[PDB]
Structures are given as C-alpha cells and as structure tokens.
C-alpha cells in the first residue's frame, strides 16, 4: 500500500456509491470505474440495535471509519453517486445521505462531482402492496 505520485500536486481520485434507504446505512468506496472495492462499511457494523442502525448518528459512525481506513492507503479526492431506495419504491433519499457525505468533509477528504443514481423506471412491474393500500 504505497502508490507512486508527485508529492506536492496530485490527489488520487475515486468514486463512492452511497446507498441510502430508510432501514440501513451503506458507504462503498471503489476505483474510477467502480469494478474493484477498497473500503466498505455499513451502519450495522457500527451500531447494534435493529431500529437505530440507519439513524443520522448510525450514518456518521460509519463515515469516520471509512476515512480512517481511507487515509492509510492514502486517498484524498473522490467522485460521488448517491442513491435512494428506488425501483418501484421510494425515490426520496434516506437518513444516511447528508450525515454520511458531510461527515467525510470533516474527516480529511475532498468532494468532487455529485448527482443522483436511483433506479427509476420508464414503467414498471406491479408494486408490492395491494390495490387497497397498506393499512395503518
């Protein structure tokens, strides 16, 4: 783990596929292409209580421990491709999006290109749940 680079003017780029549904937090650093994987950690690794694994604190406890293991190989900059559950279910992002992204802006990393990469359809298979709703 020692990459040869010009010491005083080059930061090694990357990309992170930030998955953010309501029931878990995920962070996943990869190469430029996305094919390999370098430093992955969830909210489940950090916090241990079924209901509060995806909470904004259970999303920030994961992102510091990305950047701990992400500063020992020696990466500085990263591209970004955020999510939200998607498909034929909710496309509004979850509570591990900003508390997972703003945490690594304090934990020794640079920020680059951002967008959404939810799955979205042109149109869909019938959705889980009835005609009559999910009563509650």
């Amino acid at each position: 783990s020692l990459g040869p680079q010009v010491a005083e003017g080059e930061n090694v780029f990357g990309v992170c596929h930030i998955f953010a549904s309501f029931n878990d937090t995920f962070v996943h650093v990869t190469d430029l292409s996305g094919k390999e994987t370098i430093c992955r950690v969830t909210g489940g690794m950090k916090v241990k209580a079924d209901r509060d694994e995806s909470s904004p604190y259970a999303a920030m406890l994961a992102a510091q421990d990305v950047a701990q293991r992400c500063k020992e190989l020696g990466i500085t900059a990263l591209h970004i491709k955020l999510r939200a559950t998607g498909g034929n279910r909710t496309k509004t992002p979850g509570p591990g999006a900003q508390s997972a992204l703003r945490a690594l802006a304090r934990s020794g990393m640079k920020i680059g290109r951002i967008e959404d990469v939810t799955p979205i359809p042109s149109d869909s298979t019938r959705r889980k749940g009835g005609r009559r709703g999910r009563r509650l």
Binding site: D31, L32, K35, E36
Partner: peptide, 10 residues
C-alpha cells in the same frame, strides 16, 4: 483534451 485520467489496481 487532457491525456491522463487516473489509476486502477489488479
């Protein structure tokens, strides 16, 4: 324009 994109590991 620019020739150098980045790096990759195998």
């Amino acid at each position: 324009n620019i020739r150098n994109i980045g790096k990759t590991l195998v």
